[PDB]
Amino acid sequence: ESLEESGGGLVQPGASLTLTCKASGFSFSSGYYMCWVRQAPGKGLEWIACTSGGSSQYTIYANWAKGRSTISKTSSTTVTLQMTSLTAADTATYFCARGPSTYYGMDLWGPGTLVTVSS
Amino acid sequence: DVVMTQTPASVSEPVGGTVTTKCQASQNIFNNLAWYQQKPGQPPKLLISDASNLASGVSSRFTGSGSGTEYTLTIGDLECADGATYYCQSTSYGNDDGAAFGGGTEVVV
Amino acid sequence: NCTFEYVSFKNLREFVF
Amino acid sequence: EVFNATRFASVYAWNRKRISNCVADYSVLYNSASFSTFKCYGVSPTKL
Ligand SMILES: *[C@@H]1O[C@H](CO)[C@@H](O)[C@H](O)[C@H]1NC(C)=O
Ligand SMILES: *[C@@H]1O[C@H](CO)[C@@H](O)[C@H](O)[C@H]1NC(C)=O
């Protein structure tokens, strides 16, 4: 299918930003989990959080962003991740990926959206 | 959250050779591993799931092995288009173990 | 369904429940 | 006896057991490496 992101770009330091991932061709059923992952411009990937689909409200947060991220499902096709107290170290490219209920690997990755934390 | 160390940081192999990558887990994961290949300017693409299963459209050259805390990724018959960065990830999404990535490894033809 | 289970006139047995 | 039983039940009418009033040791399940599809949610195997 397809996954798309919107709401990125330039964000002032110390502020809060909202990033939305939109699905096309399927629904966020309980058999698929949303996840957020980031990439530094010249470094590797860093996982952020995930949220189980369907009626379940089960969410998992990373240790580093436990107090600085909030992930929740708004609808079966749109969803938002909010991060607070943005710093220059958070300048990264965010990827929206889906996870099958089998605990298999990430398939159908999003193109990614770049966020810049600068004045 | 489980922390994942991937070695070596950089590897270089000739054309047609075999390149191996080692991924270590702080605690036991019981497989639930995923191997990815990322080209510059491209989102990562899945190669191996469950540390032993190959997905559709994935060449037999990529092979996954290991269990417990030690895992191995082997790429045989390296090609000019295989130059990329490879990553390993635990797939414990709602298990409180997290899905933290390890240090990526780049391959040089 | 069973939710719990337990296995352990000269005589006078005195019980309090 | 639940795991290494003589024979399991059929999938359509599966073997059903209730565990309560017990000191359940999940460490024996955790240490065994014969399991290849240890897939659960809500609780970590080490913190179970
Ligand atoms: C046990 O009792 C009733 C019997 O009709 C059953 O429907 C119910 O689900 C059971 N109760 C619990 C708490 O499991
Ligand atoms: C019985 O099953 C348990 C499941 O935890 C396993 O650890 C153990 O090795 C098994 N024992 C035998 C004798 O098969």
- All partners of chain B with 3 or more CB pairs under 8 angstroms: A, D
Interatomic CA distance for residues A93 and C12, integer angstroms? 80
Interatomic CA distance for residues A67 and B56, integer angstroms? 38
Task: Assign D29 to helix, strand or coil.
Answer: helix
C14–chain D nearest CA distance, Å: 27
The label of the residue with tokens 């190669």 reads B47
Burial of A118 (0-12, 13-18, 19+ CB in 10 A): exposed
Buried b (16+ CB within 10 A) or exposed e, B22-59: bbbbebbbbbbbbbbbbeeeebbbbbbbbbeebeeebe
Question: Resolution of the experimental model in angstroms, please?
Answer: 3.3
By the 8 A CB rule, do B33 and B99 touch?
Answer: no
Judged by CB atoms closer than 8 Å, whether chains meet at B43 and A111 is answered as yes
Query: Between the CA of residue A30 and those of A6, A7, A33, A41, A55, what are the distances in Å?
Result: 24, 25, 7, 33, 7
Residue nearest to atom 12 of ligand 2 (CA): D4
The DSSP code sequence of chain B is ---EEEE-SEEE--TT--EEEEEEESS---S-EEEEEE-TTS--EEEEETTTEE-TT--TTEEEEEETTEEEEEE-S--GGG-SEEEEEE--SSSSS---B---EEEE-
Elucidated via: cryo-EM
Judged by CB atoms closer than 8 Å, whether chains meet at A102 and D39 is answered as yes
Cβ of residue C8 lying under 6 Å from some atom of ligand 1:
no
Chain A residues near residue D39 by CB distance under 8 angstroms: 102-103
By the 8 A CB rule, do B88 and B4 touch?
Answer: yes
The Å distance, Cα B99 to ligand 2 centre, comes to 29
Interatomic CA distance for residues A36 and A7, integer angstroms? 14
Chain C residues near residue D18 by CB distance under 8 angstroms: 1-3
Label the pairing between strands B45-49 and B53-54: antiparallel
Note whether D22 contacts C: Cβ–Cβ < 8 A. Answer: no
Task: Assign A90 to helix, strand or coil.
Answer: helix
Judged by CB atoms closer than 8 Å, whether chains meet at D37 and B97 is answered as no
Task: Assign A22 to helix, strand or coil.
Answer: strand
Query: Could you tell me the two tokens for C2?
Result: 């069973």
Interatomic CA distance for residues B56 and B47, integer angstroms? 9
Best residue in B2, B29, B30 for a mutation probing chain D (most D CBs within 10 Å) = B30
Alpha-carbon dihedral angle through residues A100, A9, B44, A40, given to the nearest 10 degrees: -120
| Amino acid in the structure at residue D8 | F
Residue nearest to atom 3 of ligand 1 (CA): C1
Query: Could you tell me the two tokens for B63?
Result: 């092979």
Cβ of residue D29 lying under 6 Å from some atom of ligand 2:
yes
The closest alpha carbon to B89, from B31, B34, B30, B47, belongs to: B34
